[PDB]
Amino acid sequence: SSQAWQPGVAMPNLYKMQRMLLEKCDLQNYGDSATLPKGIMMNVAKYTQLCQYLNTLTLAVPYNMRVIHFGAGSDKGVAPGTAVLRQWLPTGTLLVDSDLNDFVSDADSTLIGDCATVHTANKWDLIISDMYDPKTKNVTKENDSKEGFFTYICGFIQQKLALGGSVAIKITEHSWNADLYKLMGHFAWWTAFVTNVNASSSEAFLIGCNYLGKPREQIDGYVMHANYIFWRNTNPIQLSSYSLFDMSKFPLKLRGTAVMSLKEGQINDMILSLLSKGRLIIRENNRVVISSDVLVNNENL
Amino acid sequence: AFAVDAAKAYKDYLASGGQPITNCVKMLCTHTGTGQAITVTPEANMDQESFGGASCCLYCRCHIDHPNPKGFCDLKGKYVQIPTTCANDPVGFTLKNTVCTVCGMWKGYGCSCDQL
Ligand SMILES: Nc1ncnc2c1ncn2[C@@H]1O[C@H](COP(=O)(O)OP(=O)(O)O)[C@@H](O)[C@H]1O
Ligand SMILES: [Zn+2]
Numbered sequence A: 001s002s003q004a005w006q007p008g009v010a011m012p013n014l015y016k017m018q019r020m021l022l023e024k025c026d027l028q029n030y031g032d033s034a035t036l037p038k039g040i041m042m043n044v045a046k047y048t049q050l051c052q053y054l055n056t057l058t059l060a061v062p063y064n065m066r067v068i069h070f071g072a073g074s075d076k077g078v079a080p081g082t083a084v085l086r087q088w089l090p091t092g093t094l095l096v097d098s099d100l101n102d103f104v105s106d107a108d109s110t111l112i113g114d115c116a117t118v119h120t121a122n123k124w125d126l127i128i129s130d131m132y133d134p135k136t137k138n139v140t141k142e143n144d145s146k147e148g149f150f151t152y153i154c155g156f157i158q159q160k161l162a163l164g165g166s167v168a169i170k171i172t173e174h175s176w177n178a179d180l181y182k183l184m185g186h187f188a189w190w191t192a193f194v195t196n197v198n199a200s201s202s203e204a205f206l207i208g209c210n211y212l213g214k215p216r217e218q219i220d221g222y223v224m225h226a227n228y229i230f231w232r233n234t235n236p237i238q239l240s241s242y243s244l245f246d247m248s249k250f251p252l253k254l255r256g257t258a259v260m261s262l263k264e265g266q267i268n269d270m271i272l273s274l275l276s277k278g279r280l281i282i283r284e285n286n287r288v289v290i291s292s293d294v295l296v297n298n299e300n301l
Numbered sequence B: 001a002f003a004v005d006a007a008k009a010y011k012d013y014l015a016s017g018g019q020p021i022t023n024c025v026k027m028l029c030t031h032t033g034t035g036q037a038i039t040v041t042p043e044a045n046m047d048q049e050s051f052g053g054a055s056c057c058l059y060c061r062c063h064i065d066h067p068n069p070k071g072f073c074d075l076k077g078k079y080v081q082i083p084t085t086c087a088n089d090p091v092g093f094t095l096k097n098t099v100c101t102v103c104g105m106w107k108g109y110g111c112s113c114d115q116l
């Protein structure tokens, strides 16, 4: 109904509580296409709606914020999503992006290579991923949990996401991972968010809001992905670009969320409550240092 | 002594009737901004479009060194405002035009410093 004036639709909580079996995803509006504003790329529209939705959550937004964006390149050789993130995030936010393939970016630093090669000394306040392999769209094969870059992302979250931070990780019917859904239960809240511009696709962003570093909920990710597909299969979403035309409240508010260094032993229930409310980030505030592992070979004979 | 002259090549290509560089990244914005040329966030007014800066830079897009001792880029990491009448060719526009160092507007497309 009024969903068409939202930036998109989040998975309703009752769907998260089901125990569905995995089915094929068949979308009623498959092949519909939103009419984008003149000259606007799909990926600008999509990231704009994602950010509009993230504005409604309790993201921690510290000074000296650090954001890392995986899968930021395009077959066009530019980075539309990075450009939207930089628009959204407070001026001065440190933004790093990465992709397998070369591209030109507005990020403060860019690493080209497989995401598994990326290492960072520091922790992050927000992780965005649009990584995707269109080969997974094989409807003739069983739809099993995928490894690859999802294995990397799960480990990266657990090792390098600051307590209190958040993630938005792109999935689809076939591009998903059970452990990533399980990890959503380590946040104060989570959802699967579908942009209104791309609602004819099984794509969603799995959003984990305020990381706690421990299980708050035990989630079976195989069942949860089936629950997600059941929701999509039974709830057609009207394609809509309406939210793109009101950008007056787009910028993410610079909250100046507190950042503290704390050892595990000091994370009591009061700290956990602050983390859960978007009122605290736990990490160091040292320099941001990144690298990409490079395999060396000499093929001369 | 030899240096590739990418700017001359693009200008000559355009005058020969070549298609401008595509896939410059146009941003959604209110179009109620200041209209200044190069800004930290989109600032298009009613008669401009705002673009991601790197995607509108000839040197960034062509994968070539910037014409500057330190190789710094004026556009990367910022947003560039392009008159709507010229938004078919943002790279050509940024290459051919100059920002007023006083008011931050494009000379000839917003700068009123030479008035009175
Ligand atoms: N293991 C990986 N490491 C880094 N980037 C990846 C990896 N797998 C996929 N990507 C990137 O994710 C991006 C997804 O963009 P999308 O347009 O959805 O698909 P594609 O560009 O592959 O057709 C691509 O730019 C792709 O290079
Ligand atoms: Zn440049």
Ligand SMILES: [Zn+2]
Pocket (backbone or CB within 6 Å): B100, B101, B102, B103, B104, B105, B111, B112, B113, B114
């Ligand atoms: Zn002037």
